[PDB]
Design a protein around this ligand. Structure first.
Ligand SMILES: O=C(c1cc(Cc2n[nH]c(=O)c3ccccc23)ccc1F)N1CCn2nc(C(F)(F)F)nc2C1
Length: 353
């Protein structure tokens, strides 16, 4: 009956992130089974078991047990987390990247279970359904105007920090929302210095969970080696580096990027990955993974109290002698109270070919 009371741009955002059918299609692309394991009846416990099975696998990988041991651990994961490979013979997880794949799958399942719950919630017919979904986020989203000063600056942040080795696409900013998640400013470590406005990209299936529950710490059951710098919340200062984690396609060229205030405090700087980076803090507040190019310094503005690392980017003269060197920086915090969500960008990806 009742007409939406939401701004239209917010109505389109809600419609886009609460699209269960699109999640269904995103999981199907990660080789998952949407009917045998219907997202409508996902539970935390199915996902917890998921993590547990990935831990057994990590154990085999750490022991070099790539025979029967690993074969059975992978089958238990594929049983608790139903996959649909049709005729293909379900493959072994042995590499870090294969492992990382599964973790990203469980994170999306977790955020999809949050989303499903919310969209099925009550169904009070006093308010438009968009309106209900938006209240249930407990997260304010305010459409800023194309002319607005904020749009100007974030546009420049997005374009100015597009990395040159991500030449497979450009990005156009369609819309910009101010985010105010209930409780985040109250929780936030305003005491800590070195507060930066940084990027976070995720699959389109995770935004309801991200906006409703915040960026979360990975559960204890998950394998530590899933995480290059441990179980924390990961941000970049380069737009495209985050944007790659949106997993946008030529057919699905619309994604979302997040800007958050991040209370870095004192960074523990690392050159190479280390899943156990969190124990190496010793009083420091964050991990910084160090890359070859990063925004300058001289272009850094500020915005409601956070330093926006605008570009152009520049060589940092960083290089790792004995192993891999990250192309771009990477920042990890190990507590949600070091994150305050600020903006949500609606972004068109324009793929070269
Ligand atoms: O931030 C992360 C996280 C993200 C990535 C990939 C990634 N993505 N995007 C970016 O821009 C980005 C920028 C730099 C580096 C990497 C990234 C790799 C590991 C991570 F730990 N997490 C917090 C949210 N979260 N929630 C859960 C759960 F499962 F509990 F629900 N697990 C997590 C994990």
């Amino acid at each position: 009956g009742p007409e939406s009371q939401l701004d239209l741009r917010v109505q389109e955002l809600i419609k886009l992130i609460c699209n269960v059918q699109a999640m269904e299609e995103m999981m199907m692309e990660m080789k998952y089974n949407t009917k045998k394991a219907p997202l409508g009846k996902l539970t935390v416990a199915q996902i917890k078991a998921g993590y547990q099975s990935l831990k057994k696998i990590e154990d085999c990988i750490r022991a070099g047990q790539h025979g029967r041991a690993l074969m059975e651990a992978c089958n238990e994961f594929y049983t608790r987390i139903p996959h649909d490979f049709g005729l293909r013979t379900p493959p072994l997880i042995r590499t870090q990247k294969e492992l990382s794949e599964k973790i990203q799958l469980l994170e999306a399942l977790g955020d999809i279970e949050i989303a499903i719950k919310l969209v099925k919630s009550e169904r009070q017919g006093l308010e438009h359904p968009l309106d209900q979904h938006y209240r249930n986020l407990h997260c304010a989203l305010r459409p800023l105007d194309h002319e607005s000063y904020e749009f100007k600056v974030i546009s420049q942040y997005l374009q100015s920090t597009h990395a040159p080795t991500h030449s497979d696409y450009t990005m156009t900013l369609l819309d910009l929302f101010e985010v105010e998640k209930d409780g985040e400013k109250e929780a936030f470590r305003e005491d800590l210095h070195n507060r930066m406005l940084l990027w976070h990209g995720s699959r389109m299936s995770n935004w309801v969970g991200i906006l409703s529950h915040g960026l979360r710490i990975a559960p204890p059951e998950a394998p530590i080696t899933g995480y290059m710098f441990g179980k924390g919340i990961y941000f970049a200062d380069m737009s495209s580096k985050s944007a790659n984690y949106c997993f946008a396609s030529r057919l699905k060229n619309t994604g979302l990027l997040l800007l958050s205030e991040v209370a870095l405090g004192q960074c523990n700087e690392l050159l190479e990955a280390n899943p156990k980076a969190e124990g190496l803090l010793q009083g420091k507040h964050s991990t910084k993974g160090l890359g070859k190019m990063a925004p300058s310094s001289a272009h850094f503005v500020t915005l409601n109290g956070s330093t926006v690392p605008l570009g152009p980017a520049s060589d940092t003269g960083i290089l790792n002698p004995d192993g891999y060197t990250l192309n771009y920086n990477e920042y990890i915090v190990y507590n949600p109270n070091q994150v305050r969500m600020r903006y949500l960008l609606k972004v068109q990806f324009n793929f070269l070919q």
